[PDB]
Write a protein that binds this ligand. Structure first.
Ligand SMILES: [K+]
Ligand SMILES: [K+]
Ligand SMILES: [K+]
Ligand SMILES: [K+]
Ligand SMILES: [K+]
Ligand SMILES: [K+]
Ligand SMILES: [K+]
Ligand SMILES: [K+]
Ligand SMILES: [K+]
Ligand SMILES: [K+]
Ligand SMILES: [K+]
Ligand SMILES: [Mg+2]
Ligand SMILES: [Mg+2]
Ligand SMILES: [Mg+2]
Ligand SMILES: [Mg+2]
Ligand SMILES: [Mg+2]
Ligand SMILES: [Mg+2]
Ligand SMILES: [Mg+2]
Ligand SMILES: [Mg+2]
Ligand SMILES: [Mg+2]
Ligand SMILES: [Mg+2]
Ligand SMILES: [Mg+2]
Ligand SMILES: [Mg+2]
Ligand SMILES: [Mg+2]
Ligand SMILES: [Mg+2]
Ligand SMILES: [Mg+2]
Ligand SMILES: [Mg+2]
Ligand SMILES: [Mg+2]
Ligand SMILES: [Mg+2]
Ligand SMILES: [Zn+2]
Ligand SMILES: [Zn+2]
Lengths: 36, 135, 248, 114, 69, 91, 98
RNA sequence: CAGGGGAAUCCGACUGUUUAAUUAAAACAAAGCAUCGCGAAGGCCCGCGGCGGGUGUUGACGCGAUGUGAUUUCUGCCCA
RNA sequence: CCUUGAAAAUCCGGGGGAGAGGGUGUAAAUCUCGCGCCGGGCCGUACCCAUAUCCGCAGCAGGUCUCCAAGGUGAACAGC
């Protein structure tokens, strides 16, 4: 599972996967979402 | 790879400033023979700006948009890293590691960190950084 | 010619429950909007011993849905629940040990803990340690559920009756022999004044129907009719049979 | 040996009648009536057995005449909660709120289909 | 009772309004100046003798300078 | 050395109460006073506090269990049956 | 087959690779950026599970949820003590892939 | 200061309790065993009276009513 | 421990932040810091507490709740 399962023979899962490469402010990403 | 970098927002886990949000100014992650552990120079806020509403008034809004800041050197084990990052241009010559010997310089570093936080608190950017963590 | 023991028990004076150190009435939370339509989450804060009761009590803290306050409940602890566990009460709560949810929204074989006798009161059935009630059958019409009580009797109750899922803790407490008269003394000192039981045949005729005689004998059938007046109905009251129960 | 007597009319060895031996400048042994042993606060978490540090252990009515510093610690929940459980709640608050963002984003990307 | 370590703080405690009296005690190895204030009796201990003579000369006027011998 | 041949823990009761009752209470008192392994922290500190109340000294987690054993055989099958009824209910 | 494969692989990580056992060391290795696989027993406290997963997300490292507990994870590592969290620095066995 | 001992029979298992002021016992109690009533509009009981009160801050692993009297081993036939 | 061994007055810490404070003054709101000023009313308080101050008709070998506790011998608050 996730974007790392390629490089691991065993099963790897992470609950916070979707937060990867997201350093932006959650309130402003929300504002963008309800804008669109 | 390594993620404790300048500009990264961390949460203070121990000390007087427990539960405060702060931004890493300098990371050492190697020791300095006087702090052999991995530590980082940190600029946080002591007092969060108060909630401001539309029916409040300019002077009261200005009074409530005031930030008290702190500068500290924290061991990594007392910091909780977050995924967020603020690119606030803190002056390194003012906010650096020699500032903890001279109290007058430390007031100067806290002053400089304060005004940069306040101007970034305006324009409504980086809202998560300037909100008190509820716990 | 004297008021017998058992008759004196109704006056209460000395035969009252020893409730000084009891921790409170163990009850489900009162049915409200949240529990009627969805679920409310509570946290198990402590599991405590209730004097005079062989079943642990669970202290569960809920959020008040209408005002900024914390509500503390005193649930009867189903076996397997631990401190720090989240328990969920309501119609929409899922099947887990400790959750409180109506019997009508349960599978046909689930076994419950603190069953409601009427749709709205708190738990009344299967409250003693190691006991449980089984859900037998629902019927979607007329909002009825049929359950099996610890005594083995079948009861028809409303589908809105709530119950805790699982078996009350305290396990096979009765399995251990008491051994010592003193252990029975401490057991009943926390309950009421009932333990040291003098046989009626060892009494005089004035204080018991079985008293008297030059040999300790009953002298009359110990089975007594249901309509016998108080002070007379002692022994086996309205007994359908006597003996040894060979067969079932 | 010089034997002692109670100095008050309470003649029973009750919890409020505890005494200690004192030698006066007059070179005689007398009873001094002690105060009960105070306890430090227990942590508000209710999960750790040790009592709080940095706070004086006195009887409850003595705390009225103590200064603020002697009754708390300079940290959030100081004098009410232990440091360890404060750290746990800081981390738990952040992680649970972050996980709320995950499920919010997860439905946002899953609602792209009609 | 409160103990005063050095000299000058003893002087203003001596010229406080509530300072009722000063008692001078000479021991075999020190001289104790005790000023009776409203709440405490403040004692200043000087091991050397000429300092004690200096202090007694410079005590504020209008205040009892009772000497214990 | 082996101090007792067979009484073991019920040696405190002496000759009193009958052999069968001492034998019957023997297994109960062994389970009742045993330290189980905690399923939460993994330590062998899970011991009985009162009847039906089991507490761990390490992680301070209190659980509701059996009178004498950590969990009764009935409750274990109860939990398995309730679980099975749960995935029957959903799909 | 996977249950015995990870245990067999975890054995070959020992005596043939660099690892580190324990919560405090694991966090230190993750934030130094040289942890590759972090293994958590299901016995792990839930807060500790979430914290390590958040750390791994920041450090781009895989988290494997072991199907045992700190006792039988310790036996899988060949140790006589409980291990609730461990990190692998290099494999020596290819439980991770290049 | 400070146990006479041994071989047996009867009864009660033991520890406990009892007729203050003639009976301390083999009597009562006891754990154990058995039976009976009762799912609350209920069982048992109090109450001149109140939909009053006790068990009951209780719910069959519980309350209430009896008999027998640890353990062991058994507990036969008779419902006229 | 099938026994889990009060309650309430009272005091305190924390969370939150409605508000208040002043315009750079020899400043404000405020202060659980130091010192200083004033007050604390009402009732009880002697003595016995027992082989003579209590109950038992009495200066009655009876009864009546507690605290302190030296040296020798000795296992010892035993006895001497
Ligand atoms: K009568
Ligand atoms: K008989
Ligand atoms: K302090
Ligand atoms: K005895
Ligand atoms: K006797
Ligand atoms: K009734
Ligand atoms: K019978
Ligand atoms: K017959
Ligand atoms: K017949
Ligand atoms: K405050
Ligand atoms: K008296
Ligand atoms: Mg009897
Ligand atoms: Mg008789
Ligand atoms: Mg009669
Ligand atoms: Mg008779
Ligand atoms: Mg007989
Ligand atoms: Mg008193
Ligand atoms: Mg002294
Ligand atoms: Mg006897
Ligand atoms: Mg017998
Ligand atoms: Mg007697
Ligand atoms: Mg007599
Ligand atoms: Mg006699
Ligand atoms: Mg028998
Ligand atoms: Mg009996
Ligand atoms: Mg505050
Ligand atoms: Mg007197
Ligand atoms: Mg006399
Ligand atoms: Mg008279
Ligand atoms: Zn704590
Ligand atoms: Zn544990």
């Amino acid at each position: 599972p996730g974007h790392l399962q390629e490089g691991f023979g065993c099963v790897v899962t992470n609950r916070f996967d979707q937060l990867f490469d997201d350093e932006s402010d959650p309130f402003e990403v929300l504002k963008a979402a309800e804008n669109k | 790879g390594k993620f404790m970098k300048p500009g990264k927002v961390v949460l203070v886990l121990a000390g007087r400033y427990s539960g405060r949000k702060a931004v890493i100014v300098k990371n050492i992650d190697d020791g300095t023979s006087d702090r052999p552990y991995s530590h980082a120079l940190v600029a946080g806020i002591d007092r969060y700006p108060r909630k401001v509403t539309a029916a409040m008034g300019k002077k009261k809004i200005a009074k409530r948009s005031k930030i008290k800041s702190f500068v500290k050197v924290y061991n990594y084990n007392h910091l909780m890293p977050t995924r967020y990052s603020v690119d606030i241009p803190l002056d390194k010559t003012v906010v650096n590691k020699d500032v903890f010997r001279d109290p007058a310089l430390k007031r100067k570093a806290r002053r400089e960190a304060k005004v940069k936080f306040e101007e970034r608190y305006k324009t409504g950017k980086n809202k998560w950084f300037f909100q008190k963590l509820r716990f | 010619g004297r008021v017998i023991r058992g008759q004196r028990k109704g006056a209460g004076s000395v035969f009252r429950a020893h409730v000084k150190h009891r921790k409170g009435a163990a009850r489900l939370r009162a049915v409200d909007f949240a529990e009627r339509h969805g679920y409310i989450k509570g946290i198990v804060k402590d599991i405590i011993h209730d004097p005079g009761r062989g079943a642990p009590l669970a202290k569960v803290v809920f959020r008040d849905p209408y005002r900024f306050k914390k509500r503390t409940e005193l649930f009867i602890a189903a076996e397997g629940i631990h401190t720090g566990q989240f328990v969920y009460c309501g119609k929409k709560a899922q099947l887990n040990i400790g959750n409180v949810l109506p019997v009508g929204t349960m599978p046909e074989g689930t076994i419950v803990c603190c069953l409601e006798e009427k749709p709205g009161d708190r738990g009344k059935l299967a409250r003693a340690s190691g006991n449980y009630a089984t859900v037998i059958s629902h019927n979607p019409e007329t909002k009825k559920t049929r359950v099996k009580l610890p005594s083995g009797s079948k009861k028809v109750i409303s589908s809105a009756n709530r119950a805790v899922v699982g078996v009350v803790a305290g396990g096979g407490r009765i399995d251990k022999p008491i051994l010592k008269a003193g252990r029975a003394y401490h057991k009943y000192k926390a309950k009421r004044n009932c333990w040291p039981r003098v046989r009626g045949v060892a009494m005089n005729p004035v204080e018991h129907p079985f008293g008297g005689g030059n040999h300790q004998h009953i002298g009359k059938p110990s089975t007594i009719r249901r309509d016998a007046p108080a002070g007379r109905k002692v022994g086996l009251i309205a007994a359908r049979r006597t003996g040894r129960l060979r067969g079932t | 040996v010089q034997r002692l007597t109670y100095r008050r009319r309470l003649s029973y060895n009750t919890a409020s009648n505890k005494t200690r031996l004192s030698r006066t400048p007059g070179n005689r042994i007398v009873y001094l009536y002690t105060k009960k042993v105070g306890k430090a606060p227990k942590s508000a978490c209710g999960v750790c057995p040790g009592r709080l540090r940095g706070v004086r252990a006195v009887r409850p009515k003595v705390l009225m005449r103590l200064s603020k510093t002697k009754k708390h610690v300079s940290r959030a929940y100081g004098g009410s909660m232990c440091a360890k459980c404060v750290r746990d709640r800081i981390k738990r608050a952040f992680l649970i709120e972050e996980q709320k963002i995950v499920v919010k984003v997860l439905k946002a990307q899953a609602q792209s289909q009609k | 009772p409160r103990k005063i370590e050095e000299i000058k703080d003893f002087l203003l405690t001596a010229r406080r309004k509530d300072a009722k009296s000063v008692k001078i005690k000479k021991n075999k190895d020190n001289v104790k100046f005790k000023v009776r204030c409203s709440r405490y009796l403040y004692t200043l201990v000087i091991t050397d003798k000429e300092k004690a003579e200096k202090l007694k000369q410079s005590l504020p006027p209008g205040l009892a300078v009772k000497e214990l011998k | 050395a082996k101090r007792t041949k067979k009484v073991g823990i019920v040696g405190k009761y002496g000759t009193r109460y009958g052999a069968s009752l001492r034998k019957m209470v023997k297994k109960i008192e062994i389970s009742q006073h045993a330290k189980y392994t905690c399923s939460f922290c993994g330590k062998t500190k899970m011991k009985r506090r009162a009847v039906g109340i089991w507490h761990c000294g390490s992680c301070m987690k209190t659980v509701a269990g059996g009178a004498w054993t950590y969990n009764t055989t009935s409750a274990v099958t109860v939990k398995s049956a309730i679980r099975r009824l749960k995935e029957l209910k959903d799909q | 087959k996977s249950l015995e494969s990870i245990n067999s692989r975890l054995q070959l990580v020992m005596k043939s690779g660099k690892y580190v056992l324990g919560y405090k060391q694991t966090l230190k290795m993750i934030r130094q950026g040289k942890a590759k696989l972090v293994i958590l027993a299901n016995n792990c406290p839930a807060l500790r599970k979430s914290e390590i997963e958040y750390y791994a997300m920041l450090a781009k490292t895989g988290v494997h949820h072991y199907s045992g507990n700190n006792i039988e994870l310790g036996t899988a590592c060949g140790k006589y003590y409980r291990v609730c969290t461990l990190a692998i620095i290099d494999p020596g066995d290819s439980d991770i892939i290049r």
